[PDB]
Amino acid sequence: MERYENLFAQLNDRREGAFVPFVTLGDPGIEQSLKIIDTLIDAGADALELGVPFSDPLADGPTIQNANLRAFAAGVTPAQCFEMLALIREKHPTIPIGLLMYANLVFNNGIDAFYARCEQVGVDSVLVADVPVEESAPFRQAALRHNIAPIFICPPNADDDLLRQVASYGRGYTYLLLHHLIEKLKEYHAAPALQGFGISSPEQVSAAVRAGAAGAISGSAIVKIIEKNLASPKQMLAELRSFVSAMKAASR
Amino acid sequence: MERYENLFAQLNDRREGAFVPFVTLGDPGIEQSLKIIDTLIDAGADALELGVPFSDPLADGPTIQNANLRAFAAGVTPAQCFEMLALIREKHPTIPIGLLMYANLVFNNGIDAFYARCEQVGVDSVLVADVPVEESAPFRQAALRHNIAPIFICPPNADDDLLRQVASYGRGYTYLLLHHLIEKLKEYHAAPALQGFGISSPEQVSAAVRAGAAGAISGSAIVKIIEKNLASPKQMLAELRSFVSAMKAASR
Amino acid sequence: TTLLNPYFGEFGGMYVPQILMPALNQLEEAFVSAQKDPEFQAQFADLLKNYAGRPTALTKCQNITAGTRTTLYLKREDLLHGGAHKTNQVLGQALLAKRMGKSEIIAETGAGQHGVASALASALLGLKCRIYMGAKDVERQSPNVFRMRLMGAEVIPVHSGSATLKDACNEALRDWSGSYETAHYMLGTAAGPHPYPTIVREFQRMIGEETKAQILDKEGRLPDAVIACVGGGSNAIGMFADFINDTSVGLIGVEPGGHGIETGEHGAPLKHGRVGIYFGMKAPMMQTADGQIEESYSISAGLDFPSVGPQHAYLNSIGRADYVSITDDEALEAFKTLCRHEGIIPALESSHALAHALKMMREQPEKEQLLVVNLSGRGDKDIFTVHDILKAR
Amino acid sequence: TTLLNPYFGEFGGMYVPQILMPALNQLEEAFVSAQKDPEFQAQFADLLKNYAGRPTALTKCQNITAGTRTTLYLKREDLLHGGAHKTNQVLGQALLAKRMGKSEIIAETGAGQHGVASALASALLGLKCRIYMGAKDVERQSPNVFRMRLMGAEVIPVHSGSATLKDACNEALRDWSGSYETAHYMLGTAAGPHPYPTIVREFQRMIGEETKAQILDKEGRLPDAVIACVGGGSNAIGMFADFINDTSVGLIGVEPGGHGIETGEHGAPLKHGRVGIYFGMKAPMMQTADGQIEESYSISAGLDFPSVGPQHAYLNSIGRADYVSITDDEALEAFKTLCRHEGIIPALESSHALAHALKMMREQPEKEQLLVVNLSGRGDKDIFTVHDILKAR
Numbered sequence A, B: 001m002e003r004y005e006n007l008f009a010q011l012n013d014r015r016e017g018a019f020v021p022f023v024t025l026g027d028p029g030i031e032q033s034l035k036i037i038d039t040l041i042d043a044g045a046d047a048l049e050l051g052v053p054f055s056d057p058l059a060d061g062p063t064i065q066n067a068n069l070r071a072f073a074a075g076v077t078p079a080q081c082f083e084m085l086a087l088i089r090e091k092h093p094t095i096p097i098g099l100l101m102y103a104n105l106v107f108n109n110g111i112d113a114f115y116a117r118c119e120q121v122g123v124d125s126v127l128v129a130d131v132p133v134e135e136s137a138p139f140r141q142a143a144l145r146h147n148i149a150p151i152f153i154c155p156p157n158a159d160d161d162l163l164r165q166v167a168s169y170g171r172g173y174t175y176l177l178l179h180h181l182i183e184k185l186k187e188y189h190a191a192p193a194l195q196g197f198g199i200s201s202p203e204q205v206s207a208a209v210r211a212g213a214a215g216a217i218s219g220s221a222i223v224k225i226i227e228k229n230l231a232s233p234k235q236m237l238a239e240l241r242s243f244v245s246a247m248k249a250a251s252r
Numbered sequence C, D: 001t002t003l004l005n006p007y008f009g010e011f012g013g014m015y016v017p018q019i020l021m022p023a024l025n026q027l028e029e030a031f032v033s034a035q036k037d038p039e040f041q042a043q044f045a046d047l048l049k050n051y052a053g054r055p056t057a058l059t060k061c062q063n064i065t066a067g068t069r070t071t072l073y074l075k076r077e078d079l080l081h082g083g084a085h086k087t088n089q090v091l092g093q094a095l096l097a098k099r100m101g102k103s104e105i106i107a108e109t110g111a112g113q114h115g116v117a118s119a120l121a122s123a124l125l126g127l128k129c130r131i132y133m134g135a136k137d138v139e140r141q142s143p144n145v146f147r148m149r150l151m152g153a154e155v156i157p158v159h160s161g162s163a164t165l166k167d168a169c170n171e172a173l174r175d176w177s178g179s180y181e182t183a184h185y186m187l188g189t190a191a192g193p194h195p196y197p198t199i200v201r202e203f204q205r206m207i208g209e210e211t212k213a214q215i216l217d218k219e220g221r222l223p224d225a226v227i228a229c230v231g232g233g234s235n236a237i238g239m240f241a242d243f244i245n246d247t248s249v250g251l252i253g254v255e256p257g258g259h260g261i262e263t264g265e266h267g268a269p270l271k272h273g274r275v276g277i278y279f280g281m282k283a284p285m286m287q288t289a290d291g292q293i294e295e296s297y298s299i300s301a302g303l304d305f306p307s308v309g310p311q312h313a314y315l316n317s318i319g320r321a322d323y324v325s326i327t328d329d330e331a332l333e334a335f336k337t338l339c340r341h342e343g344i345i346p347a348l349e350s351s352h353a354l355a356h357a358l359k360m361m362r363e364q365p366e367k368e369q370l371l372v373v374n375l376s377g378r379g380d381k382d383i384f385t386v387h388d389i390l391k392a393r
Ligand SMILES: O=C(NCCOP(=O)(O)O)c1ccc(OC(F)(F)F)cc1
Pocket: C108, C109, C110, C111, C112, C113, C114, C115, C165, C169, C170, C173, C187, C188, C189, C191, C192, C193, C232, C278, C279, C280, C302, C305
């Protein structure tokens, strides 16, 4: 499909940035995660980034390490996560859905098979946290064969060789961590840039778009709301809705 | 004095062996040791061998190690032992009294001074357990200058050179541990031999004399009686008297 | 782009987040430069000789082999400063950090030996050392924790995941990704992302080089086999490397069998795991059917790295090296045998290598064979472990 | 009659009961024969090289001496097999026992290091080893007791006297007097009756011989002073012996000062005891005014032999060697300093030698001096001792 391309064209027609929250699938449980994700969409999320719990998430900070542990406490498996993804896509046909994966979960039972499963449940992109562009060929190839966009991190100090690789290899969007990088990425016809570091307040959403990025990704701020409201599931959803509405409003 | 020489001449005139018990001075206390020693004499002991408690008696077996510990528990010092010796000699003018010493107690405040103290309280001999004949010159010289007989152990495997040294250097008696050694000691005009190993029964006393020794020394058997009867001081003396009378009778 | 091959056949690679790639590239270039630099080599040789005590002895074991046709030699890395082979490569990596202008050392540790080795190298060379260690391991390795702090290292308990070695590995990497301009990551085995499997091998390769010279001096020929335990792979590849091109010399690596391969309570991923991608590398590992990373179990905690160095997986795949397993009980018996018959207390790690040599001898006692066991460490650290088990019997 | 002088000036001798004299005479003759025997020397050299790991390194300590005019080297007996210098002379005595046709070894031990050293030598050379140890020491040295039994030695608790080292010394002698036709007494220091002070010196003299060669190689001159701790005297006389005729080289022995010489709770008989006769020798010792033998006290139990080797008393009396004391607190500070600044954990015994060198440096930091400390042992055994004291502060 072309869900990212459709979303960005529609957002451009409204002179609008995208707001993309990150949550861990199954945190703090399967049913509550499904409600959390529906609330994020209903509150105005333009796209989702969704992590599959992994034992050794060596690219995530403590807030997300704890989300993984909560999901594991509930017995959440990658198999169950794919069941969730199919339910989510069935409720929401057009929202782009990206996964944040660790390499072993992609490689485990076959790279091609993983991306085929992604295609079958309606996923749009996969960012493999511990696969640098230098190692990415079998991953991005399998992604593209199954109509999945491979997403790559563009680090703040990326040199020109890295910028060219990320521009050539990525699709869907460029995960972006003096707006020099944004201009070079556009110069190299990269996928539209989403700013992903330090997005916790509406002011940061507006500032990322003003710099020339197509939108902003916020995960820790969303996950911290889940963490803070564990004992009150209903207040959790209400606080999620309040926060995403404010963040999305800042992209208009 | 010539107490050993007088005793042996008198014993020879009676065709008699000497019986010599060994006890530790001050075991199990000063007053009871004084009674023990008086009982040994009254029961027929021909001479005494008396140990001064020392911290590291590395020539004594467990029975005598324990006697030393009992004396130390009672606070017995070499100074107190010499006070005891003077009292003993004052009660008994002719019985030969020999000390068994460790070298440090002799060397401690001066070798000459120790042997002068021996002479002043009426001691007749000193055997220094850890001074071999090869090291003995300052000890035997100081002994002889103060009319003290230096006693030397003649081991069962002593070679001819050692036999000659023991015969030349010893006085009073030779401490003896197929009666070959007894004959060689007499051939070399040694001091009369007292047999000191394994004398615990009257049969051993008679057998030592029959072999040609002038008598027998028994310590562990005497000390074991003290050990066995600690709770009953009076039965201890009675049992001491019974045992020494039997041992002395075997030398007639 | 790299200067050196990051792969050993299909195994190895550089599977780190993009932000860590410059750190690895910088490290590879400094290593390649240092290997061409006679002054770096001479400085490293000098520390190995005058501080660590190289060369280590090669000790014959006639008491153990009497009546058989086995001749057994022990390569005495137990006599190295620190009590284990780990000292060789931390000294080299410490010099590499200084070459790079780094003033801080990050290290991970499980049972604590690499923590101690990193701390002593750092103390000697004036580096500020911080050591990540799973909170469970901190609790059960107080002697090594104490050593680490006595030498001025900062020991940081990790509470994430299972709070064992693999989680200390994650936390060291997270730290290095943000601090690598001033800190070097002193990785503890011949695994992880390139260039670490290559660097650690080259900084341990004097083990095999010395063994070859010593065996030629004493026997006039190369060994029939050299045998080493395999937790992460550094002492085995250090023994193996100089013999790889000597095709007649068998290379035998011994993984921990734990309670038995069939119980699943073991530490033998090379022969009984499944290839995955973790710790920056494609290698056999302990993992669930789902692909979650698991622990290794051994009586010897030093063998509990849940994967294996990629060069070992490659050497196995082409048949150049053979890998076997030894159980807790076999290792304990070899430990007792060496104490009683040679007066040497071996590390329980090394006891796995010794145990397999003993089985080679005992199974075929009239087979002519000249064997070298890499005695990777001394076993003072294990005497209470061994005491408690023998008393519970 | 003896082949060799049993005395060092007034000190030394053969103060044993007559029945032990043939054992000493037999041992002296076998030793004098072995010292003429190139094959004995070559066998001993081979074990020292290929089993014990000699030569040991000589390590410079620039981190400790920076900014001063002291150059400090450590003679690394901590790297010897077993972790202390005691291994050198037990191997030689074990070969002596075999030369004499003996199949059994008797040994005494206090803190247990000599027990472990005697047990490992016996295991290697197929001797039946029995070790006497005061029951108080057995209770408080379980790690060394375990090592001793793992290597097949029989450990026999002594309950007599104060049931410490001096009482284990008595019991070993009592045993030897009746068993010396088939058993050799493996005495643990350079003390006791002749020929032991001479034999132990000669079986430890490679320490000083190597130090001389290593210092000439590295500095082009002999040391200004060599410094060693003195518990019984074996590591100090091993360092000293090859330098005695080099009159410009200071010889400094360091006795334990314990809580302070003035407290009386110390272990420094050479400078603060009184000459007596015990342990088969005339030497300074800890004793009451009455002449009963007392204990030494040190934080380091290995320094608690309550006398000193007669050759040290002689070297002091003629002014060839100087003897000083270091307190528990000074030794602890030197222990911490070496851990933090060189990554070496020294034995608390050896820390007394290091502490005195540190004071030599610190008191006169612009004095030119080239110093060698004999690092007699490693200090893994002491880390809990040091941990508890530093935590109680
Ligand atoms: O096993 C490892 N370290 C050895 C620890 O030494 P010890 O003290 O014996 O546990 C080890 C550490 C890191 C590693 O890669 C990566 F950094 F990515 F995690 C792979 C293996």
